A paper describes a structure:
We therefore determined the three-dimensional structure of the Tae4/Tai4 effector/immunity system from Salmonella typhimurium by X-ray crystallography. Tae4 cleaves the γ-D-glutamyl-L-meso-diaminopimelic acid amide bond as do Tae1 members; however, it specifically hydrolyzes the acceptor stem of the muropeptides. Thus, Tae4 adopts the classical papain-like fold of cysteine peptidases of the NlpC/P60 family. Moreover, the immunity protein Tai4 represents a new family of T6SS immunity proteins forming a heterotetramer with its cognate effector Tae4.
Crystals of the effector/immunity system Tae4/Tai4 from S. typhimurium readily grew to a size of 400×100×100 µm3 within 3 days in 2-ethoxyethanol containing conditions. Experimental phases were obtained from a Single-wavelength Anomalous Diffraction (SAD) experiment and an initial structure was built and refined to a resolution of 2.3 Å. Native protein crystals of identical crystal symmetry diffracted to a resolution of 1.8 Å at the Swiss Light Source (Villigen, CH), allowing the refinement of a structural model at near atomic resolution. Both models were finally refined to excellent stereochemistry, with 97% of the residues in preferred regions of the Ramachandran plot. The core of the Tae4 effector is formed by a central antiparallel β-sheet flanked by α-helices. As a true NlpC/P60 papain-like cysteine peptidase, Tae4 has a catalytically important cysteine residue (Cys44) in its active site. Similar to Tsi1, Tae4 locks up the active site by inserting the loop region between the α-helices d and e (d-e-loop) into the active site and thereby prevents substrate binding and catalysis. Most importantly, the hydroxyl group of Ser98 in this loop forms a hydrogen bond to the Nδ atom of the catalytic His126 of Tae4, preventing it from deprotonating the catalytic Cys44 residue. In contrast to the Tse1/Tsi1 complex which has been reported to be a heterodimer, we found that the inhibited Tae4/Tai4 protein complex from S. typhimurium forms heterotetramers. In this heterotetrameric assembly, the two polypeptide chains of a Tai4 homodimer inhibit two Tae4 molecules.
Numbering used by the authors:
A (entry chain A), D (entry chain A): 2 to 141, 148 to 161
B (entry chain B), C (entry chain B): 27 to 127
């Protein structure tokens, strides 16, 4: 099944910090790589934290690049990998929206994926959405969203 | 403007990572270091390789970033260490060898 | 350590000049700018080309140094402008065309 | 013939400053290129200033890369070019010293060329020497001199 919304939202908050702080929180190889500056985009790491924390851990043999935290659980560090991981584990998405805007997602909550153009470091973003705002809203213009995808969390 | 990041081949991304990461090592200024760090992470995003290849590129980078370069003008020639680095035979061979194409 | 400066071919020197000069344009910190400036001058020393080829490389560099690059992480991605710059087709053609080999 | 020593030493002092200041002093294309940061090694520019000032101007059609100053005279900007220019205009050198040290040049004054290894921006240096010190002594270790060459100035 899927992580409960409430547990997911709570888990995300623990790691809704600068990527350096995320490294201190999670530790292990996640922390070592952030300390070394190898990871600068915390987005897929936070999403991994959520899945790990809510009883839906990323499997070790999952076909995506990942590093372990001090918890001995696994953290995907590429956005594209995180997106693809969800496509393969979450089931059928509940909303798929071409040329999306935030107002298309009002009234529904869960895991949101937006893919678009305009960013130089990624094809898109993955976060949580509570029906009004994203969980990392405080960290987020020139990005033009092409496709919006939501998996509802109960 | 979107950068050209998605247009690079896998070995080009690794070469681009090598250069930017090396620049992140040699420069002291935080804004510059962060910038080079952020730039390197973009090339890591699009790579298909495990994190250890970047660790190894960093191992080779540190053989240049630790060098002392001198001249008849006042400078540490930090930029030049990284330019010398990206022409490194072991770096290019490491990248060509890669298990994850 | 002496750098590898004398080992570069003429077009390699021009490519090395292009990169370091572009880095001198995009970074704000004086120590970094001076360093990149000093590094570029080393490649100019060993060139056989007139100063106008460097002026033209600078003309092309300014088409990248003026760009605004954005991402899902906080950065101006200055380093990346210069990495995109050195893959520029007009730059490589300019260098290949050169009258002074 | 050759520039007099006294006039050469005097001329050199006018431009014995930071490369930025040299650009302000000389002006024209020298100044424009220094302002643009294209020239950072003032060594061959100062030597050019000396020859220009003392009645031995660098000829326009001289086979070396050069730029004009506000004076409409010509300034060689590569050390190797400056060295070669002197070899071709100054006549037979008066002292050539393998593996030189400063003490080999005591008692004689003129234009000194040292070529060696250890510098990342040049194969050597060209300056004036008064029998005790160089004219740019205040601006000058890891350089290992291979060959020292002096043209005596009267």
């Amino acid at each position: 099944n899927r992580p409960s919304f409430n547990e997911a939202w709570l888990a995300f908050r623990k790691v809704n910090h600068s990527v350096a702080d995320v490294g201190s929180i999670i530790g292990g190889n996640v922390g070592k790589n952030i300390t070394g500056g190898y990871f600068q985009n915390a987005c897929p790491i936070r999403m991994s934290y959520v899945l790990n924390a809510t009883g839906f851990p990323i499997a070790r043999n999952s076909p995506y690049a990942k590093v372990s935290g001090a918890d001995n659980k696994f953290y995907i560090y590429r956005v594209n990998d995180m997106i693809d991981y969800l496509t393969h584990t979450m089931g059928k998405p509940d909303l798929i929206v071409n040329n999306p805007k935030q107002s298309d997602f009002i009234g529904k909550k869960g895991i949101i994926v937006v893919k678009g153009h305009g960013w130089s470091n990624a094809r898109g973003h993955v976060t949580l959405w509570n029906g009004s705002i994203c969980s990392d809203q405080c960290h987020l213009g020139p990005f033009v969203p092409e496709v919006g995808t939501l998996w509802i969390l109960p | 403007q979107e950068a050209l990041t998605t247009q690079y081949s896998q070995s080009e991304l690794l070469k681009n990572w090598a250069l930017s990461h090396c620049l992140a090592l040699v420069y002291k200024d935080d804004v510059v270091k962060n910038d080079a760090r952020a730039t390197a992470s973009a090339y890591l995003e699009y790579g298909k390789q495990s994190v250890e290849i970047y660790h190894e590129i960093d191992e080779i980078a540190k053989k240049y970033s630790g060098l002392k370069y001198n001249g008849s003008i006042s400078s540490d020639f930090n930029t030049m260490k990284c330019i010398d680095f990206i022409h490194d035979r072991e770096l290019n061979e490491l990248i060509k060898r890669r298990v994850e194409k």
